[PDB]
Amino acid sequence: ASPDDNFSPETLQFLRNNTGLDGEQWNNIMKLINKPQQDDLNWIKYYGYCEDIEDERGYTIGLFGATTGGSRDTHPDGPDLFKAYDAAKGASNPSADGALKRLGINGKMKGSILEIKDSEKVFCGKIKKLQNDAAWRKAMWETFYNVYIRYSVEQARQRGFTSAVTIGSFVDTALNQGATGGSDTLQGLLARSGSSSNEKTFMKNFHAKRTLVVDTNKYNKPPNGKNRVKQWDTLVDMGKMNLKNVDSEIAQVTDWEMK
Numbered sequence: 003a004s005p006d007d008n009f010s011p012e013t014l015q016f017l018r019n020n021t022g023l024d025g026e027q028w029n030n031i032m033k034l035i036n037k038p039q040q041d042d043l044n045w046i047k048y049y050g051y052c053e054d055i056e057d058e059r060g061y062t063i064g065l066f067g068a069t070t071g072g073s074r075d076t077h078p079d080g081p082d083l084f085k086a087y088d089a090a091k092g093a094s095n096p097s098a099d100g101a102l103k104r105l106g107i108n109g110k111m112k113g114s115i116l117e118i119k120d121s122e123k124v125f126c127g128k129i130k131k132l133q134n135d136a137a138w139r140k141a142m143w144e145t146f147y148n149v150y151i152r153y154s155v156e157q158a159r160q161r162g163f164t165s166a167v168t169i170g171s172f173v174d175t176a177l178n179q180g181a182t183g184g185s186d187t188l189q190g191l192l193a194r195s196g197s198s199s200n201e202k203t204f205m206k207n208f209h210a211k212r213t214l215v216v217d218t219n220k221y222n223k224p225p226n227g228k229n230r231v232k233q234w235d236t237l238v239d240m241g242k243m244n245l246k247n248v249d250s251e252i253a254q255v256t257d258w259e260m261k
C-alpha cells in the first residue's frame with residue numbers, strides 16, 4: 003500500500019503544504035519516532051495509547067507521548083491535546099476541562115497540569131477507546147503540529163535545511179525533550195550546536211549535543227536514548243537525507259534492543 007494511506011487526507015495535504023514533506027517521508031519519520039516510544043514501527047496502532055510510565059509526567063498518551071503533567075513536566079502538552087479534541091467534537095468554547103467532562107473523566111486543569119482523579123485503569127480505558135475516533139486523531143495531529151512540528155520546521159528552514167532527516171530529527175528531539183524552554187529542549191540543544199551552514203556538519207554536532215542529555219531526566223531509559231539519536235545520525239552518515247526509498251535502511255537503524 004501507499005504510505006500516504008496512513009494519514010487523513012487533511013493531514014497529508016497540510017503536512018505537504020507546511021513542511022515540504024510527502025507521505026512516504028512522514029510515514030518514515032513516524033516509524034523512526036515510534037521505535038523508541040513503542041518498540042515497533044507500527045505507529046498507526048498508537049492513537050489510543052495511554053500509560054503512566056512512572057516518570058513524574060502524569061499519563062503519557064498517543065503518537066507523540068503527550069503528557070498530562072507532573073513534577074517533571076509542569077508545562078505539559080496533554081492539556082492542549084484535550085482542548086483540541088473538545089474543539090474537534092464541536093465545543094463552542096473548547097477546553098481541557100470540557101474534553102474531560104465530555105469523556106466522563108474525573109479531572110480538570112490545576113495550573114498548567116491536568117489533574118486526573120480517575121484511576122489509570124479507568125482513565126486509560128477511556129483513552130484506548132479513542133484509537134479509531136476521527137476527532138481524536140484530528141486533534142492529535144493538530145497538537146503535534148502546533149507544539150512540535152511547526153517550530154522544528156521553522157528552525158530547520160531558518161538554517162537552510164529542508165531535508166526529511168533534519169526535520170525528523172528536530173521533531174523527535176522536540177517531542178521527546180520539549181520544543182522550547184530549558185537546556186535539553188530542541189531550542190536549548192540548537193543553542194549549543196553552532197552555526198555551520200553545512201547540513202551534515204551541523205547535524206553531526208547537534209546529534210552529539212543531544213546524545214549528552216537524551217538518557218537523562220527520564221527522557222529515555224539508557225541506552226534507549228543513545229540509540230534513538232543514533233538512528234538519525236546513521237541516516238545522516240548514510241547520506242539518506244530525503245527518507246525516500248529507505249525501507250531497508252530504516253529496518254537497519256531501528257534494529258536495536260529496547261531496555
Ligand SMILES: N[C@@H]1[C@@H](O)[C@H](O[C@@H]2O[C@H](CO)[C@@H](O[C@@H]3O[C@H](CO)[C@@H](O[C@@H]4O[C@H](CO)[C@@H](O)[C@H](O)[C@H]4N)[C@H](O)[C@H]3N)[C@H](O)[C@H]2N)[C@@H](CO)O[C@H]1O
Binds near residue numbers: 062075
Ligand atoms: N519519558 C518520555 C517523555 O519525556 C516524553 O514526553 C515529553 O517529555 C518532554 C520532556 O520532559 C516534555 O517537554 C515539555 O515540552 C513542552 C512543549 O515544548 C515545554 O513547554 C514549554 O515550556 C516553556 C517553559 O519551559 C514555555 O515557555 C512554553 O510556552 C511551553 N510550551 C515544556 O517545558 C517541556 N517540559 C513533553 O511535554 C512530554 N510530552 C514522551 C514523548 O517522547 O516519551 C516518554 O517516553
Ligand SMILES: C[As](C)(=O)[O-]
Binds near residue numbers: 259
Ligand atoms: C529486531 As531485534 C532489536 O529483537 O534484534
Ligand SMILES: [Zn+2]
Binds near residue numbers: 054
Ligand atoms: Zn503500569
Ligand SMILES: [Zn+2]
Binds near residue numbers: 054056
Ligand atoms: Zn504513577
Ligand SMILES: [Zn+2]
Ligand atoms: Zn507554550
Ligand SMILES: [Zn+2]
Binds near residue numbers: 235236239
Ligand atoms: Zn555517525
Ligand SMILES: [Zn+2]
Binds near residue numbers: 247248249250
Ligand atoms: Zn534500497
Ligand SMILES: [Zn+2]
Binds near residue numbers: 259260
Ligand atoms: Zn529484540
